Amino acid sequence: SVTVYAAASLTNAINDLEKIYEKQNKVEVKTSYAGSSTLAKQIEAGAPADIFISADTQWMDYLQNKKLVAANDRINLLGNRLVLITPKGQSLNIKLDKATDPNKVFTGKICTGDTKSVPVGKYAKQAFTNLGWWNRIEPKLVETEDVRVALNFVARGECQVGIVYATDAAISKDVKVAGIFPENTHSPIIYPLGLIKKNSNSAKFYQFLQSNQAKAVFKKYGFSML
């Protein structure tokens, strides 16, 4: 078998690819999704993941510094964009620009991942800092342990707006995009793919995730290929 730990933003794409791979191979693929931080820390503590896909460079570097992945056993696989979302039925259009006053446009709570550890939240904090909004945004935050928990709080109306990836907004019929963060407000959203356990079955799945067949799945869900 092969165990794959993947950032929560990858849930749908990796579930689709698991099913494809299981149809094409006599191999069982086990999946675990959570925030990239949680998953990396679990691997560090001994969890038997064969493959790790992070939603940022930092949590793969965290493992590399601990000798848990080699520099030549990781590759930058996918990109994404950062977006503002609203619940369906409370649509907004907000310009993610220094000129905008967050106290005027954000009149309730703002849901996103924990800004110190979860990739989506870290990207969000970079953008708020770049925009000059941080000290006005922070008091409004509800912080979650992965991007899909935040997506669901917005879907359920618990938060007026949320910050998720473009791919998350596309997967949920219950939220709409209110704005797209310009790329120059944050570090590029990059998903590194890492081979943690080197065996025949894990190396084959790692190559499969780079394959022409997988590119089609990731593009369907709105990721960019790097």
Side-chain angles (χ1 to χ4, degrees), residues 1-22 24-25 27-57 59-115 117-157 159-172 174-226:
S1 75
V2 179
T3 297
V4 175
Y5 278 22
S9 51
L10 289 170
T11 297
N12 302 78
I14 299 292
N15 278 340
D16 277 4
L17 292 166
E18 163 191 0
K19 197 190 173 303
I20 289 162
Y21 199 78
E22 291 191 339
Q24 285 175 189
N25 300 279
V27 159
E28 175 166 54
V29 176
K30 288 150 172 113
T31 64
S32 183
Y33 306 113
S36 297
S37 41
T38 294
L39 297 170
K41 278 169 198 183
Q42 288 170 348
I43 291 169
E44 180 192 12
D50 292 89
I51 293 183
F52 175 45
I53 322 179
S54 181
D56 78 0
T57 286
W59 285 108
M60 183 91 45
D61 283 2
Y62 181 86
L63 295 181
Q64 190 182 313
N65 301 335
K66 282 146 217 314
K67 307 292 189 79
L68 300 185
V69 63
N72 285 14
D73 293 323
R74 53 183 283 182
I75 191 160
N76 290 349
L77 191 70
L78 310 166
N80 216 327
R81 296 202 77 190
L82 199 68
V83 306
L84 261 182
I85 53 166
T86 61
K88 144 168 76 65
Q90 291 114 69
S91 265
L92 297 175
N93 186 243
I94 290 155
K95 214 201 160 58
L96 303 142
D97 188 279
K98 302 214 145 113
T100 291
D101 182 356
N103 279 328
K104 183 182 208 63
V105 299
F106 306 124
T107 56
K109 296 189 253 322
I110 301 172
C111 274
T112 195
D114 184 293
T115 61
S117 56
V118 179
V120 72
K122 295 166 55 183
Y123 293 119
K125 187 194 188 184
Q126 287 182 314
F128 298 136
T129 298
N130 178 272
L131 293 169
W133 297 357
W134 178 240
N135 73 10
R136 298 174 274 178
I137 290 288
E138 187 174 12
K140 310 182 174 295
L141 288 178
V142 173
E143 285 165 298
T144 64
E145 290 295 331
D146 71 49
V147 70
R148 292 297 181 87
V149 183
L151 177 71
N152 291 324
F153 272 59
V154 175
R156 303 193 290 269
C159 253
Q160 179 180 84
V161 308
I163 301 189
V164 300
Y165 304 109
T167 58
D168 303 308
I171 213 72
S172 177
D174 299 300
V175 307
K176 295 230 163 273
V177 173
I180 303 175
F181 286 84
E183 282 311 301
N184 81 332
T185 61
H186 59 81
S187 295
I189 296 162
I190 292 173
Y191 291 73
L193 163 70
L195 185 63
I196 303 311
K197 302 183 37 170
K198 311 175 39 102
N199 58 74
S200 166
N201 295 328
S202 71
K204 266 207 244 143
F205 194 82
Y206 176 84
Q207 179 56 51
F208 167 73
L209 292 175
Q210 300 165 74
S211 75
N212 191 78
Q213 178 167 45
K215 168 167 159 205
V217 173
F218 289 126
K219 274 182 100 213
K220 175 204 199 211
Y221 284 105
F223 295 91
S224 53
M225 302 310 291
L226 296 181

Coordinates of all heavy atoms in Angstrom, one line a residue, residues 86-157, unseen atoms left out:
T86 N -17.6 34.9 0.3 CA -18.8 35.1 1.1 C -19.7 34.0 1.0 O -19.7 33.1 0.1 CB -19.5 36.4 0.5 OG1 -19.9 36.1 -0.8 CG2 -18.7 37.6 0.6
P87 N -20.7 33.9 1.9 CA -21.8 32.9 1.7 C -22.6 33.3 0.5 O -22.8 34.5 0.2 CB -22.6 33.1 3.0 CG -21.8 33.8 4.0 CD -20.8 34.7 3.1
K88 N -23.0 32.3 -0.2 CA -24.0 32.5 -1.3 C -25.2 33.3 -0.7 O -25.6 33.0 0.4 CB -24.4 31.2 -1.8 CG -25.9 31.1 -2.3 CD -26.1 29.8 -3.1 CE -26.2 28.6 -2.2 NZ -27.4 28.6 -1.2
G89 N -25.7 34.3 -1.4 CA -26.8 35.1 -0.9 C -26.4 36.3 -0.1 O -27.2 37.1 0.3
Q90 N -25.1 36.5 0.2 CA -24.6 37.7 0.7 C -23.3 38.1 -0.1 O -22.2 38.3 0.5 CB -24.2 37.6 2.2 CG -25.5 37.4 3.1 CD -25.5 36.1 3.7 OE1 -24.7 35.8 4.6 NE2 -26.5 35.3 3.3
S91 N -23.5 38.3 -1.4 CA -22.4 38.6 -2.3 C -21.8 40.0 -2.0 O -22.6 40.9 -1.7 CB -22.9 38.5 -3.7 OG -22.6 37.2 -4.3
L92 N -20.5 40.1 -2.2 CA -19.8 41.3 -2.1 C -18.8 41.4 -3.2 O -18.4 40.3 -3.8 CB -19.0 41.5 -0.8 CG -19.8 41.5 0.5 CD1 -18.9 41.6 1.7 CD2 -20.7 42.7 0.5
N93 N -18.3 42.6 -3.6 CA -17.1 42.7 -4.4 C -16.2 43.7 -3.6 O -16.5 44.9 -3.4 CB -17.4 43.3 -5.8 CG -16.2 43.3 -6.6 OD1 -15.7 44.4 -7.1 ND2 -15.6 42.2 -6.9
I94 N -15.0 43.2 -3.2 CA -14.1 44.0 -2.4 C -12.8 44.0 -3.2 O -12.3 43.0 -3.7 CB -13.9 43.4 -1.0 CG1 -15.1 43.6 -0.2 CG2 -12.6 43.9 -0.3 CD1 -15.3 42.5 0.9
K95 N -12.2 45.2 -3.3 CA -10.9 45.4 -3.9 C -9.8 45.2 -2.9 O -9.7 45.9 -1.9 CB -10.7 46.7 -4.7 CG -9.8 46.5 -5.9 CD -9.2 47.8 -6.4 CE -8.0 47.5 -7.3 NZ -8.2 46.6 -8.4
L96 N -8.9 44.2 -3.1 CA -7.8 43.9 -2.2 C -6.7 44.9 -2.6 O -5.7 44.5 -3.2 CB -7.5 42.4 -2.3 CG -8.7 41.6 -1.9 CD1 -8.9 40.4 -2.6 CD2 -8.8 41.4 -0.4
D97 N -6.8 46.1 -2.1 CA -5.9 47.2 -2.5 C -5.7 48.1 -1.2 O -6.6 48.2 -0.4 CB -6.5 48.1 -3.6 CG -5.6 49.1 -4.1 OD1 -5.5 50.2 -3.5 OD2 -5.0 48.9 -5.2
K98 N -4.5 48.6 -1.1 CA -4.2 49.5 0.1 C -5.3 50.6 0.3 O -5.6 51.0 1.4 CB -2.9 50.3 -0.2 CG -1.7 49.5 -0.4 CD -0.4 50.1 0.2 CE 0.5 49.1 0.7 NZ 1.8 49.0 -0.1
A99 N -6.0 51.1 -0.8 CA -6.9 52.1 -0.7 C -8.2 51.7 0.1 O -8.9 52.6 0.6 CB -7.3 52.7 -2.0
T100 N -8.5 50.4 0.1 CA -9.7 49.9 0.7 C -9.6 50.0 2.2 O -8.5 49.6 2.8 CB -9.9 48.5 0.2 OG1 -10.3 48.6 -1.2 CG2 -11.0 47.8 1.0
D101 N -10.6 50.4 2.9 CA -10.6 50.4 4.4 C -11.3 49.1 4.9 O -12.5 48.9 4.8 CB -11.4 51.6 4.8 CG -11.4 51.8 6.4 OD1 -10.9 50.9 7.1 OD2 -11.9 52.8 6.8
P102 N -10.5 48.2 5.5 CA -11.1 46.9 5.9 C -12.2 47.1 7.0 O -13.1 46.3 7.1 CB -9.9 46.1 6.5 CG -8.9 47.2 6.8 CD -9.1 48.2 5.7
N103 N -12.1 48.2 7.8 CA -13.2 48.5 8.7 C -14.5 48.9 8.1 O -15.5 48.7 8.7 CB -12.7 49.5 9.7 CG -11.8 48.9 10.8 OD1 -12.0 47.8 11.2 ND2 -10.9 49.8 11.3
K104 N -14.5 49.4 6.9 CA -15.7 49.7 6.2 C -16.3 48.5 5.4 O -17.5 48.4 5.3 CB -15.4 50.8 5.1 CG -16.6 51.3 4.4 CD -16.3 52.3 3.3 CE -17.5 53.2 3.1 NZ -17.9 54.0 4.3
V105 N -15.4 47.6 4.9 CA -16.0 46.5 4.0 C -16.1 45.2 4.8 O -17.0 44.4 4.4 CB -15.1 46.3 2.8 CG1 -15.2 47.5 1.9 CG2 -13.7 45.9 3.1
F106 N -15.4 45.0 5.9 CA -15.5 43.8 6.7 C -16.2 44.2 8.0 O -15.6 44.7 8.9 CB -14.1 43.2 7.0 CG -13.3 42.9 5.8 CD1 -12.0 43.4 5.7 CD2 -13.8 42.1 4.7 CE1 -11.3 43.2 4.5 CE2 -13.0 41.8 3.6 CZ -11.7 42.3 3.5
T107 N -17.5 44.0 8.1 CA -18.3 44.4 9.2 C -18.7 43.3 10.1 O -19.5 43.5 11.1 CB -19.6 45.1 8.7 OG1 -20.3 44.2 7.8 CG2 -19.3 46.4 7.9
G108 N -18.2 42.0 9.9 CA -18.4 40.9 10.8 C -17.1 40.2 11.0 O -16.1 40.8 11.2
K109 N -17.2 38.9 11.0 CA -16.0 38.1 11.2 C -15.4 37.7 9.9 O -16.0 37.6 8.9 CB -16.3 36.9 12.1 CG -16.8 37.3 13.5 CD -16.9 36.1 14.5 CE -18.3 35.7 14.8 NZ -19.2 36.9 14.9
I110 N -14.1 37.3 10.0 CA -13.3 36.9 8.9 C -12.7 35.5 9.2 O -11.9 35.4 10.1 CB -12.2 37.9 8.5 CG1 -12.7 39.3 8.2 CG2 -11.3 37.3 7.4 CD1 -11.6 40.3 8.1
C111 N -13.1 34.5 8.5 CA -12.6 33.1 8.8 C -11.5 32.7 7.9 O -11.6 32.9 6.7 CB -13.8 32.2 8.4 SG -15.0 31.9 9.7
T112 N -10.4 32.2 8.5 CA -9.3 31.6 7.7 C -8.5 30.7 8.5 O -8.9 30.4 9.7 CB -8.4 32.7 7.0 OG1 -7.6 32.1 6.0 CG2 -7.5 33.4 8.0
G113 N -7.5 30.1 8.0 CA -6.6 29.2 8.7 C -5.8 30.0 9.8 O -5.5 31.2 9.6
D114 N -5.4 29.3 10.8 CA -4.5 29.9 11.8 C -3.3 30.6 11.1 O -2.6 30.0 10.3 CB -4.0 28.9 12.8 CG -3.1 29.5 13.9 OD1 -2.0 30.0 13.6 OD2 -3.6 29.7 15.0
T115 N -3.1 31.9 11.4 CA -2.2 32.7 10.6 C -0.7 32.5 11.0 O 0.1 32.9 10.2 CB -2.5 34.2 10.8 OG1 -2.4 34.6 12.2 CG2 -3.9 34.5 10.3
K116 N -0.5 31.7 12.1 CA 0.9 31.4 12.4 C 1.3 30.0 11.8 O 2.6 29.9 11.6 CB 1.1 31.3 13.9
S117 N 0.4 29.2 11.5 CA 0.8 27.8 11.1 C 0.2 27.2 9.9 O 0.9 26.5 9.1 CB 0.5 26.9 12.3 OG -0.8 26.9 12.7
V118 N -1.1 27.5 9.6 CA -1.8 26.8 8.5 C -1.4 27.6 7.2 O -1.6 28.9 7.2 CB -3.3 26.8 8.7 CG1 -4.0 26.2 7.5 CG2 -3.7 26.0 9.9
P119 N -1.0 27.0 6.1 CA -0.6 27.7 5.0 C -1.5 28.8 4.5 O -1.1 30.0 4.3 CB -0.3 26.7 3.9 CG 0.2 25.5 4.7 CD -0.8 25.5 5.9
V120 N -2.8 28.5 4.4 CA -3.7 29.5 3.9 C -3.7 30.8 4.8 O -3.8 31.9 4.3 CB -5.1 29.0 3.6 CG1 -5.9 28.7 4.9 CG2 -6.0 29.9 2.7
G121 N -3.6 30.5 6.1 CA -3.6 31.7 7.0 C -2.3 32.4 6.9 O -2.3 33.7 7.1
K122 N -1.2 31.7 6.8 CA 0.1 32.4 6.6 C 0.1 33.3 5.3 O 0.6 34.4 5.4 CB 1.2 31.4 6.5 CG 1.4 30.6 7.8 CD 2.3 29.4 7.6 CE 3.7 29.7 7.0 NZ 4.5 28.5 6.8
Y123 N -0.4 32.7 4.2 CA -0.5 33.5 3.0 C -1.4 34.7 3.3 O -1.1 35.9 2.8 CB -1.0 32.7 1.8 CG -0.2 31.6 1.3 CD1 -0.7 30.3 1.3 CD2 1.0 31.8 0.7 CE1 0.1 29.2 0.8 CE2 1.8 30.8 0.1 CZ 1.3 29.5 0.2 OH 2.1 28.5 -0.4
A124 N -2.5 34.5 4.0 CA -3.4 35.6 4.2 C -2.8 36.7 5.0 O -2.9 37.9 4.7 CB -4.7 35.1 4.9
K125 N -2.0 36.3 6.0 CA -1.3 37.3 6.9 C -0.3 38.1 6.1 O -0.2 39.3 6.2 CB -0.7 36.7 8.1 CG -0.2 37.8 9.1 CD 0.7 37.2 10.1 CE 1.0 38.4 11.1 NZ 2.0 38.0 12.2
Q126 N 0.5 37.4 5.2 CA 1.4 38.1 4.3 C 0.6 39.2 3.5 O 1.1 40.4 3.4 CB 2.1 37.2 3.3 CG 3.1 36.3 3.9 CD 3.8 35.5 2.8 OE1 3.1 35.0 1.9 NE2 5.1 35.5 2.8
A127 N -0.5 38.9 3.0 CA -1.3 39.8 2.2 C -1.8 40.9 3.0 O -1.7 42.1 2.6 CB -2.4 39.1 1.4
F128 N -2.4 40.6 4.2 CA -2.9 41.7 5.0 C -1.8 42.7 5.4 O -2.0 43.9 5.5 CB -3.5 41.2 6.3 CG -4.7 40.4 6.0 CD1 -4.9 39.2 6.7 CD2 -5.7 40.8 5.1 CE1 -6.0 38.4 6.5 CE2 -6.8 40.0 4.9 CZ -6.9 38.8 5.6
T129 N -0.6 42.2 5.7 CA 0.6 43.0 6.1 C 1.0 43.9 4.9 O 1.2 45.1 5.0 CB 1.7 42.1 6.5 OG1 1.3 41.4 7.7 CG2 2.9 42.9 6.8
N130 N 1.0 43.2 3.7 CA 1.4 44.0 2.5 C 0.5 45.1 2.3 O 0.9 46.2 1.8 CB 1.5 43.1 1.3 CG 1.9 43.8 0.0 OD1 1.0 44.3 -0.7 ND2 3.2 43.9 -0.2
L131 N -0.8 44.9 2.5 CA -1.9 45.9 2.2 C -2.0 47.0 3.3 O -2.7 47.9 3.1 CB -3.2 45.2 2.1 CG -3.4 44.3 0.9 CD1 -4.7 43.5 0.9 CD2 -3.4 45.2 -0.4
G132 N -1.3 46.8 4.5 CA -1.5 47.7 5.6 C -2.7 47.5 6.4 O -3.2 48.4 7.1
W133 N -3.3 46.3 6.3 CA -4.6 46.0 7.0 C -4.4 45.2 8.2 O -5.5 45.0 8.9 CB -5.5 45.2 6.0 CG -6.0 45.8 4.7 CD1 -5.8 47.1 4.2 CD2 -6.9 45.2 3.8 NE1 -6.4 47.2 3.0 CE2 -7.1 46.1 2.7 CE3 -7.5 43.9 3.7 CZ2 -7.9 45.7 1.7 CZ3 -8.3 43.6 2.6 CH2 -8.5 44.5 1.6
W134 N -3.3 44.7 8.6 CA -3.2 43.7 9.6 C -3.8 44.1 10.9 O -4.6 43.3 11.5 CB -1.7 43.2 9.8 CG -1.6 42.1 10.9 CD1 -0.9 42.3 12.1 CD2 -2.3 40.9 11.0 NE1 -1.0 41.1 12.9 CE2 -1.9 40.3 12.2 CE3 -3.2 40.2 10.2 CZ2 -2.3 39.0 12.6 CZ3 -3.6 38.9 10.6 CH2 -3.2 38.3 11.8
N135 N -3.4 45.3 11.5 CA -3.9 45.6 12.8 C -5.4 45.9 12.8 O -6.0 45.9 13.9 CB -3.1 46.6 13.5 CG -3.3 48.0 13.0 OD1 -4.1 48.3 12.2 ND2 -2.4 48.9 13.5
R136 N -6.0 46.1 11.7 CA -7.5 46.2 11.6 C -8.2 44.9 11.3 O -9.4 44.7 11.7 CB -7.9 47.3 10.5 CG -7.4 48.7 10.9 CD -7.7 49.7 9.8 NE -6.6 49.6 8.8 CZ -6.6 50.3 7.6 NH1 -7.5 51.1 7.3 NH2 -5.6 50.1 6.8
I137 N -7.5 44.0 10.6 CA -8.0 42.6 10.3 C -8.0 41.7 11.5 O -9.0 41.0 11.8 CB -7.3 42.0 9.1 CG1 -7.5 42.8 7.8 CG2 -7.6 40.5 9.0 CD1 -8.9 42.5 7.3
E138 N -6.9 41.7 12.3 CA -6.7 40.7 13.3 C -7.9 40.6 14.3 O -8.3 39.5 14.6 CB -5.4 40.9 14.0 CG -5.0 39.8 15.0 CD -3.7 39.9 15.6 OE1 -3.0 40.9 15.5 OE2 -3.3 38.9 16.3
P139 N -8.4 41.7 14.8 CA -9.5 41.6 15.8 C -10.8 40.9 15.2 O -11.7 40.6 16.0 CB -9.8 43.1 16.1 CG -8.6 43.8 15.8 CD -8.0 43.1 14.6
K140 N -10.9 40.7 13.9 CA -12.1 40.2 13.3 C -11.9 38.7 13.0 O -12.9 38.0 12.5 CB -12.4 40.9 12.0 CG -12.4 42.4 12.1 CD -12.7 43.1 10.7 CE -12.9 44.6 10.8 NZ -14.1 44.9 11.6
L141 N -10.8 38.1 13.3 CA -10.4 36.7 12.8 C -11.1 35.6 13.6 O -11.1 35.6 14.8 CB -8.9 36.5 12.8 CG -8.1 37.3 11.8 CD1 -6.6 37.0 12.1 CD2 -8.5 36.9 10.4
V142 N -11.6 34.6 12.8 CA -11.8 33.3 13.4 C -10.9 32.3 12.7 O -10.8 32.3 11.4 CB -13.3 32.8 13.1 CG1 -13.5 31.4 13.6 CG2 -14.2 33.7 13.9
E143 N -10.0 31.6 13.4 CA -8.9 30.9 12.8 C -9.2 29.4 13.0 O -9.6 28.9 14.1 CB -7.6 31.2 13.5 CG -7.0 32.5 13.1 CD -5.9 33.0 14.1 OE1 -6.2 33.1 15.3 OE2 -4.8 33.0 13.6
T144 N -9.0 28.6 11.9 CA -9.2 27.2 11.9 C -8.0 26.4 11.6 O -6.9 27.0 11.2 CB -10.3 26.9 10.8 OG1 -9.7 27.3 9.5 CG2 -11.5 27.7 11.0
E145 N -8.0 25.1 11.7 CA -6.8 24.3 11.6 C -6.6 23.7 10.1 O -5.6 23.1 9.9 CB -6.9 23.1 12.6 CG -6.6 23.7 14.0 CD -5.3 24.3 14.2 OE1 -4.3 23.8 13.5 OE2 -5.1 25.3 14.9
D146 N -7.5 24.0 9.2 CA -7.3 23.8 7.8 C -8.3 24.7 7.0 O -9.3 25.2 7.6 CB -7.2 22.4 7.3 CG -8.5 21.7 7.3 OD1 -9.5 22.2 6.8 OD2 -8.5 20.5 7.8
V147 N -8.0 24.8 5.8 CA -8.7 25.7 4.9 C -10.2 25.2 4.7 O -11.1 26.0 4.5 CB -8.0 26.0 3.6 CG1 -8.0 24.7 2.7 CG2 -8.7 27.1 2.8
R148 N -10.4 23.9 4.7 CA -11.8 23.4 4.5 C -12.7 23.7 5.7 O -13.9 23.9 5.5 CB -11.7 22.0 4.1 CG -11.1 21.8 2.7 CD -11.9 22.5 1.6 NE -11.4 22.3 0.3 CZ -11.7 21.2 -0.5 NH1 -12.4 20.3 -0.1 NH2 -11.2 21.2 -1.8
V149 N -12.1 23.7 6.9 CA -12.9 24.1 8.1 C -13.4 25.5 7.9 O -14.6 25.9 8.2 CB -12.2 23.9 9.4 CG1 -13.1 24.3 10.6 CG2 -11.7 22.5 9.5
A150 N -12.5 26.4 7.4 CA -12.9 27.8 7.2 C -13.9 27.9 6.1 O -14.9 28.6 6.2 CB -11.6 28.6 6.9
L151 N -13.7 27.2 5.0 CA -14.7 27.2 3.9 C -16.1 26.8 4.5 O -17.1 27.4 4.1 CB -14.3 26.2 2.8 CG -15.2 26.0 1.7 CD1 -15.3 27.2 0.8 CD2 -14.8 24.8 0.9
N152 N -16.2 25.8 5.4 CA -17.5 25.4 5.9 C -18.1 26.4 6.8 O -19.3 26.6 6.7 CB -17.3 24.0 6.5 CG -17.0 22.9 5.5 OD1 -17.5 23.0 4.4 ND2 -16.2 22.0 5.9
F153 N -17.3 27.1 7.6 CA -17.9 28.1 8.4 C -18.5 29.2 7.6 O -19.6 29.7 8.0 CB -16.8 28.7 9.3 CG -16.6 28.0 10.6 CD1 -16.3 26.7 10.7 CD2 -16.8 28.7 11.8 CE1 -16.1 26.0 11.9 CE2 -16.6 28.0 13.0 CZ -16.2 26.7 13.1
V154 N -17.9 29.6 6.5 CA -18.5 30.6 5.6 C -19.7 30.0 4.9 O -20.8 30.7 4.9 CB -17.4 31.0 4.5 CG1 -18.1 32.0 3.5 CG2 -16.3 31.7 5.1
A155 N -19.7 28.8 4.4 CA -20.8 28.2 3.8 C -22.0 28.2 4.8 O -23.2 28.5 4.4 CB -20.5 26.7 3.4
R156 N -21.8 28.0 6.1 CA -22.9 27.9 7.1 C -23.2 29.3 7.6 O -24.1 29.4 8.6 CB -22.5 27.0 8.2 CG -22.2 25.5 7.8 CD -22.2 24.6 9.0 NE -21.0 24.8 9.9 CZ -19.8 24.2 9.8 NH1 -19.6 23.3 8.9 NH2 -18.8 24.6 10.6
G157 N -22.7 30.4 7.1 CA -23.0 31.7 7.6 C -22.4 32.1 8.9 O -22.7 33.2 9.5

